[PDB]
Amino acid sequence: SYDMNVETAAELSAVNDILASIGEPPVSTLEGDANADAANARRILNKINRQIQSRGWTFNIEEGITLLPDVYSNLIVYSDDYLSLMSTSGQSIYVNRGGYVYDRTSQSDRFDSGITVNIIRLRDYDEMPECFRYWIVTKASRQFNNRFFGAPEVEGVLQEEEDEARRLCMEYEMDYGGYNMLDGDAFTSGLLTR
Amino acid sequence: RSYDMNVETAAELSAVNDILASIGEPPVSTLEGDANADAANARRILNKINRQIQSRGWTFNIEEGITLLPDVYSNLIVYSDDYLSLMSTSGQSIYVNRGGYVYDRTSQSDRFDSGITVNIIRLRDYDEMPECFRYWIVTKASRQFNNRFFGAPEVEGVLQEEEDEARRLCMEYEMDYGGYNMLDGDAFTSGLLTR
Amino acid sequence: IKTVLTYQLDGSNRDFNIPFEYLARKFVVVTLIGVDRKVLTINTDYRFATRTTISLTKAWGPADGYTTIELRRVTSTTDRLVDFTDGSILRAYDLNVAQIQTMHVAEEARDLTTDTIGVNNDGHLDARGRRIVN
Amino acid sequence: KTVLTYQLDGSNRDFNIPFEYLARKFVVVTLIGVDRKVLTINTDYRFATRTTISLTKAWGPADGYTTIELRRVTSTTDRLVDFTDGSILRAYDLNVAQIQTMHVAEEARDLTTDTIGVNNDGHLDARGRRIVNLAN
Amino acid sequence: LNLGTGQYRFPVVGNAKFNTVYILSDETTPLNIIGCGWEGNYLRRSSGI
């Protein structure tokens, strides 16, 4: 798992908002000063950053990208940044065995010339649409409000906010993906040929 | 501090932190040593649930056609505790374990010459799992460790919902990943559509 | 002294003892060299009977085509056993485990000599079988 | 530079050591010879300054023992630092804790150059030796 | 002289255990402090006794 050893000003305003969620004052830097609450907040932000990217979204899913095996090894590293390797068409055949891509079906960890896989890869919190950047915070604003300051009334308002945030996020790609029923897919695009 | 640092962490250790974050206590630095109880309990509940989430068969887990092979001298094939399921490839599985060895229930023979072919669910580690499940193995362990030790009802009632959301996402993961087809990809009604 | 040791495989011996001071356990790997490298899994085939023995379940031998059980300890560079975290007591057990693990990695780095080409009597470089490739 | 041979002709006691070491017990001195011999410390070699060892007698090419080859064997089990509960930490403590591992690694990476090894050009140089037992 | 009577409500935010408040005055004018209050969310999970 990639771990948090670097800092960012746009990311710093997120941890401030997770400390707002309890009722705590904003930190000014994430130096390492013994602020247990800030440390825990950074943990929950990262730990939830790796869900929102994991649920596949259209800009997240790189499609058709080719992973290249190292030439002498003949295997490809399947690192912890690759949230979902999948495959392009159906019955994805690649699985992580050890740390390397393994063809589940052909029982081989050795590849020559690469694979076309659809990979969802970790992107930084900053590299995220603003719609999700709110929702990664306000989802972390729930679990951080459930694990350390377990007051029920400030949670039950927050859960009604996490959901609104999710709606706004979902609205974001249904515009952004631009998905067409009868003119843009694989099956019923072919049926409409005259 | 340099932005240019890519450094990694224990995906196993970071899972035990997430358990201890959940019940509510500071992050424990190192899992090593059988002194800390919380680590041992949080690590065991992680392991004891890892063998369940995997046991339910998922498409990646289920290796198909894996040929187990008999010992040349005693002709008996071992059934380990890492074999979460061993089942026949087609139907009416005939293999069961007697005394720790694969036994053919139908022919009543513990002795196999030349091998058997089966669908094994192999037990693999938290780090070989899809992220979708690696979240759900933790947040299911985050419930039973909240259940068995920190029995406050209000945060298990919060955490339950999370385990359920995780199940939904985990399920979505293979219905994409397996890519299963009604009328073009199965055994029966793929054969009916031949013109 | 010494991280990588190999045993000899006869059909009926299944217990082999591990000299090195392994941290963890996932760190010992047991690969049946034989004719073809074959790695043994943690519980299906081999099992740690005592801290110091690895007892195979199948009791492999040459009849299966495998000789020379090679059980070497590979410390993991990425999967660190200690991750210091802000706000946590700096316990001395943590610093010592960190130092022990990195020194174990270096100790196994000292064994690559047992790994490489090899020098025969004289300066002759040697390749016992092992056709050079690339 | 964990290894360097000091071929000296007479009874020359002084042999400077450039590998900074952590302790006396790490530097082991052998005379390259028809037979290699590990000279013991108190009896045979004494550290005049930390930098320079000074042998007693020093043998010689005339003697069977020839050249002297000193080297660093930094122990991987006897840890120089043992962190304990305070026991004030000492800056000298952490830095040495990491220097021992850096030393073990650095002197272990020279146990490869003694074999084929790599020249600056990027090519694996056999030192004019003959590769035996190879297959096509 | 500006001398006044009242309640000054000021925001102290955070865990009680780690927050410190001090009143410091080096001015020529007088000072009176009658009482001090505080409010705040309290949530003990383990319902004690």
Strands D14-16 and D3-6: unpaired
Per the CB < 8 A criterion, the answer to whether B49 and C112 are in contact is: no
Q: Which residues in chain A have Cβ-Cβ distances shorter than 8 Å to C86?
A: 32-36, 39
CB D47, CB D53: distance < 8 Å: yes
Tell me the HSE value of E49 on the side-chain side, using a 13 A CA sphere: 0
Edge-to-edge strand list for the sheet holding C69-73: C4-6, C69-73, C28-32, C38-39
Q: Peptide bond before A106: cis, by omega within 30 degrees of 0?
A: no
Q: What are the structure tokens assigned to C102, written together?
A: 């990195």
b/e burial code for range C105-133 (CB count within 10 A of at least 16 → b)? bbbbbbbeeeebbbebeeeebbbeeeeee
Q: Is C83 on the interface with A (CB under 8 A)?
A: yes
Is the Cβ of C133 closer than 8 Å to some Cβ of chain D?
Answer: no
Interatomic CA distance for residues D66 and B69, integer angstroms? 60
Question: Nearest to residue C71, comparing CAs of C113, C104, C31?
Answer: C31
CA distances, A96 to each of B53, B57, B128, E14 (Å): 17, 16, 5, 45
How many whole angstroms separate alpha carbon D44 and alpha carbon D11? 13
DSSP, collapsed to helix, strand or coil, labels residue D50 as: coil
Token pair, residue A148, equals 């350390």
- Identify residue B51 by its one-letter amino acid code: R
Could you tell me the resolution of this structure in angstroms? Answer: 3.4
- Minimal Cα–Cα distance from B39 to chain E, Å? 22
Q: Which chains touch A (3 or more CB pairs under 8 A)?
A: B, C, E
Give, in order, the Cα–Cα distances in Å from A9 to each of B152, B157, D39, E14: 37, 35, 61, 23
Residue type, A178: G
Question: D90-110 burial string, b = 16+ CB within 10 Å, else e?
Answer: eeeeeeebeebbebbbbbbee
CB crowding C69-89: b at 16 or more within 10 Å, else e: bbbbbebeeebbbbbebbebe
CA distance C28 to chain A (A): 15
Does the beta-carbon distance from B10 to C81 stay under 8 Å?
yes
Q: Identify the bridge partners of residue B109 per DSSP, sorted by sequence position.
A: B104
- Interface C:B, ≥3 CB–CB pairs < 8 Å: yes
* Among A24, A151, A154, beta carbon nearest to E14: A24
What are the two backbone dihedrals, phi and then psi, of residue C6, each rounded to the nearest 5 degrees?
Answer: -120, 145
CA proximity to D68, closest of D114, D136, D129, D7: D7
Backbone angles phi, psi at B94, to 5 degrees: -100, 5
CA-based nearest residue in chain C for residue A2? C78
> 3-state secondary structure string, chain C?
CCCEEECCCCCCCCEEECCCCCCCCCCEEEEECCCCCEECCCCCCEEEEECCEEEECCCCCHHHCCCCEEEEECCCCCCCCCCCCCCCCCCHHHHHHHHHHHHHHHHHHCCHHHHCCCECCCCCEECCCCCCCC
The secondary structure of residue A91, as a DSSP letter, is: S
Q: What residues of chain E lie within 8 A of the CB of B155, using their CB?
A: 45
Please state the separation of Cα E13 from the chain's center in Å: 11
Residues 6+ apart with CB under 8 A from B117: B65, B66, B67, B68, B89
Name the residue among A6, A92, A95 with its Cβ closest to that of B1. A6
Chain C residues within an 8 Å CB radius of A36? 86-87
Are C92 and D83 an interchain contact pair (Cβ–Cβ within 8 Å)?
A: yes
> Which residue, B37, B84, B36, is CA-closest to B58?
B84
> A119 forms bridges with which residues in the sheet?
A62
Alpha-carbon gap, residue B181 to B194, rounded angstroms: 16
Question: Which residues in chain E touch residue B154, judged by CB atoms under 8 angstroms apart?
Answer: 45
- Omega prior to B140 cis, within 30 of 0: no
Residues of chain C contacting residue B25, judged by C-beta atoms under 8 Å apart: none
Of A2, A36, A86, the CB nearest to B8: A2
How far CA C33 is from CA of A74, C64, C66, C118, D124, in Å, comes to 20, 12, 6, 19, 27
